[PDB]
Design a protein around this nucleic acid. Structure first.
Ligand SMILES: Nc1ncnc2c1ncn2[C@@H]1O[C@H](COP(=O)(O)OP(=O)(O)OP(=O)(O)O)[C@@H](O)[C@H]1O
Ligand SMILES: Nc1ncnc2c1ncn2[C@@H]1O[C@H](COP(=O)(O)OP(=O)(O)OP(=O)(O)O)[C@@H](O)[C@H]1O
Lengths: 71, 423, 71, 423
DNA sequence: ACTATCCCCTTAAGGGGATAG
DNA sequence: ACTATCCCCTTAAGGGGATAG
């Protein structure tokens, strides 16, 4: 799949996914115990965002994460 | 002498006991690159050097029986150089829980891969009473190196077709057999396990074997699994919540220093089935409430250690009802406490009897567990307890001792009342 | 490769990699402009760690990152 | 009328101009799932709806010539409904930079895939002087819809074998041809481009074509590339640092609102070749210094937009020496400024002449760019300038106008002095 | 209906600078 | 030689709670 190299690349990526599954920042947030503002924050200023927030959000989207070589 | 650690025939590393009695462990450069590679314990992550933390000792000590008297029981037959973890581990170190296998470095000895000597109707009764004399883990004076953790009296066995065969060599057992402590504890559990299943809880099946003047519980192991061709019996890696945080059996209870609802629940956010496990751990909390079980100490929850370092909850196990213990003595439902406390306002409620649905939702409110989800766990119990109970009752053998059911089934309903009265 | 689901799974993973290439927290840090304390921090308390720090460190290791399904 | 956006024959979406003159763009549900999928602009990320931000307009306006007089020059021949971005884009919208291709929705017209009418030795001279009359982009009154950004006079062309063929249809050009503004600007660059290469900088090759009473520079395009079978001429997606942050050509210079060293350098940490690009952008800074180039406005740096939204720096391009301009007029090295300022103590130094190595290391100190790396860029220039110069000099054609070299080669050395005097 | 902001509060990342083991 | 801490300072994440568009 696509190799990401930045928080911004990341946000857009996950934003797309949420948009794709017709999910709302509010939905995911309620399922993993974080504020819907936290998700709005993550999609516009992902530069400064706890790794934990990262994975919870990541879990609410039902995706995982792996590390590969930047070819 | 060094001690090697293999998993399903794969050198993972090797444990070392220095002169100054310091227990160390180092991975195998080879395994640190294997397809299967994964930490031996979430508390001993893959790294190049030698680990020298207590975490090393704690992990391995938690592989031996919890009682200081049983330890001595083991140093009996096998002339171990001590009750010191390493030593015993070197002796009876072949069939521990999970899948770790300890073999002295100075001793390849490709012991029996898949051997087993079928037990005689007596032999079975023999091992099932080794606790009456001074023979621990039913290891009578006749090639047996099995290990089980815990405090009560048990012994694991293999089970091929219709025979309870004594495991031979590093051959893994398939059932963790339990003996009578609480009287008919074999029964208290066998019931508690049925009911748990009947309510949609992840628990292993359990069958009770009879041996004349003795009753023994035989539970199926969820840390074992036949391979592709029904040829090899594989061992699935796992660990209990004590090993995870790398703590000693000493702190098993939240009331010593052990972990409780929170810590644990937090740890589960990192599962590969987090959102789901995270949910089941809760549901269970509320069940331990209803049947008033009181062994919810870290050492009773296990996560599977998968490749790459993943992990998820293992089915719940060992559930005994602390109810049959009321009446006869001073002991009353007001004395019963939950191993792990849920939050409250006055601090953290931990008494079954004083506990009401509201208390769970309080806890489910701090930990951020979807209130809407807690509502659903309460509602589902509020309407399946009855049916669950009966569909079970009508199963117990026509010889199953009756108050156990009554004593357990009646208090349970009392407690459930609070539920229906709301959900 | 291995699917990670937590900051801790992450740290161990990247720690291993650095250890594997004989790198020092000090080396990588100097190449991507962050403190070597920041890297020591990341390997023991990755729960709270900016995404940016994440990728810089990630770049100094010459690895990328991708998103896959948790099967 | 709608306007569709294809890339190498792949519908990416389609631009729309509402009644209230609002420029909008939406992706194609199909492309938002393509193997090739990637944003049209880092400033317009893939999302389901309609984008309605200025970012939409800015991206497309930056596709047309920077001068308000050239815009009107275009509305000449083709009766465009206005100098309004959309309109022109609808007209001369086929061969823009990067790989975006705008075709009216109401007009499939599979225009010439790979056509081209070979130019006559005169025809060539014709287009190379269309700026003398009132014909912009050399598009004489004889099937031409090419587009180039910038401020000077240019026109791109195709080049097959040994012929300068006029692109036909949506056929991509292969060379961005430039004309004489600064006199022999064709020469100032052709020199500046050679030298840049000779110092290990990423710049496209450049050849100068002669057409009687006119000299025109022909640069090779690093946003074009033949395909597997030398059959299709593919266009590589790209954008300039203005589009990236979604700003208007208006703020090209850091002294208007445009981006500078920092912002840019920060943006590069997200490259797929970050640590390397991050380094080259700097080296270049110091080169723009040495040859005193003064066009380092965002619109002169480009990143390639790869699949999944990646991006890396494109080779540097368009480098002209602001040296031949000293002496003759009041204009002196003290008047020369660097488009992007480096940091200093008094604020941020921006004057070539007042600038010394120390200033770079100051900047390379704030941005956290390995001081040890800046030391190496200074040391490598400190000892290759001379050789670089000569090995170049001995190449310029025996007709290359001499002061250009002298005027450029001599001041350069002066500046370099500071270097050797330290590194 | 859905997301971007906000006042408000506490805990902390991460850069300077730098040493204890 | 290499990593874990530390005092110290500023900017801020993220949870409460909650509304402007
Ligand atoms: N069915 C099983 N499958 C896999 N592992 C098991 C099973 N039963 C028990 N174990 C493992 O053995 C350990 C102790 O077992 P268990 O809880 O049944 O003991 P006990 O009943 O001896 O415990 P205690 O007396 O402390 O309450 C656990 O830490 C667990 O990892
Ligand atoms: N060789 C090339 N390969 C690919 N794209 C190019 C090339 N030359 C120029 N471009 C593109 O065209 C745009 C303008 O070109 P260039 O900088 O050469 O113009 P000018 O020299 O017309 O500019 P200005 O007058 O503003 O200094 C850039 O934004 C860039 O994306």
């Amino acid at each position: 799949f696509q190799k990401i190299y930045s928080p911004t690349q990341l946000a857009n990526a996950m934003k797309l996914v949420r948009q794709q599954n017709g999910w709302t920042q509010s939905e995911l947030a309620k399922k993993i115990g974080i504020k819907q503002a936290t998700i709005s924050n993550f999609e516009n200023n992902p530069d400064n965002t706890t790794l934990t927030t990262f994975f919870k959000i990541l879990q609410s989207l039902e995706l995982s994460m792996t590390l590969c070589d930047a070819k | 002498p060094k001690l090697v650690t293999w998993m399903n025939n794969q050198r993972v590393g090797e444990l070392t006991k220095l002169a100054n009695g310091a227990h160390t462990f180092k991975y195998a450069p080879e395994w640190l690159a294997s397809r299967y590679a994964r930490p031996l314990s979430l508390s001993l992550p893959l790294q190049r050097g030698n680990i020298t933390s207590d975490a090393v000792f704690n992990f391995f000590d938690n592989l031996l029986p919890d009682s200081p008297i049983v330890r001595d029981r083991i140093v009996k037959r096998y002339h171990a150089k001590s009750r010191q973890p390493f030593d015993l581990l070197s002796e009876i170190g072949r069939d521990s829980v999970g899948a770790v296998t300890l073999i002295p470095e100075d001793e390849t000895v490709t012991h029996p891969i898949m051997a087993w000597e079928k037990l005689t109707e007596a032999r079975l009764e023999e091992v099932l009473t080794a606790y009456k004399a001074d023979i621990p883990l039913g290891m009578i004076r006749e090639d047996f190196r099995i290990s089980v953790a815990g405090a009560q009296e048990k012994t694991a066995l293999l089970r091929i077709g219709n025979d309870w065969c004594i495991p031979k060599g590093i051959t893994p057992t398939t059932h963790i057999i339990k003996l009578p402590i609480l009287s008919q504890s074999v029964d208290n559990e066998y019931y508690c396990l049925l009911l748990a299943k009947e309510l949609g809880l992840n628990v292993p099946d359990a069958e009770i074997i009879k041996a004349g003047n003795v009753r023994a519980l035989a539970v199926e192991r969820f840390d074992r699994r036949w391979n592709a061709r029904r040829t090899v019996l594989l061992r699935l890696p796992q660990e209990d919540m004590c090993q995870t945080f790398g703590l000693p059996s000493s702190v098993k209870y939240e009331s010593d220093g052990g972990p409780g609802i929170a810590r644990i629940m937090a740890f589960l956010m990192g599962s590969s089935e987090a959102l789901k496990d995270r949910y089941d751990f809760m549901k269970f909390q509320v069940f331990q409430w209803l049947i008033g079980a009181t062994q919810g100490h870290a050492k009773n929850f296990s996560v599977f250690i998968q490749a790459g370092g993943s992990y998820r909850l293992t089915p719940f196990y060992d559930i005994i009802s602390a109810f049959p213990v009321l009446g006869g003595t001073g002991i009353h439902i007001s004395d019963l406490k939950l191993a792990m406390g849920l939050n409250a306002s006055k601090g953290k409620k931990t008494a079954i009897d004083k506990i009401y649905p509201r208390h769970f939702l309080a806890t489910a409110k701090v930990l951020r567990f979807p209130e809407v989800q807690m509502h659903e766990i309460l509602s589902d119990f509020a309407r399946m307890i009855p049916a669950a109970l009966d569909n079970v009752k009508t199963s117990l053998p026509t010889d199953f001792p009756e108050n156990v059911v009554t004593a357990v089934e009646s208090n349970v309903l009392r407690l459930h009342g609070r539920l229906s009265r709301e959900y």
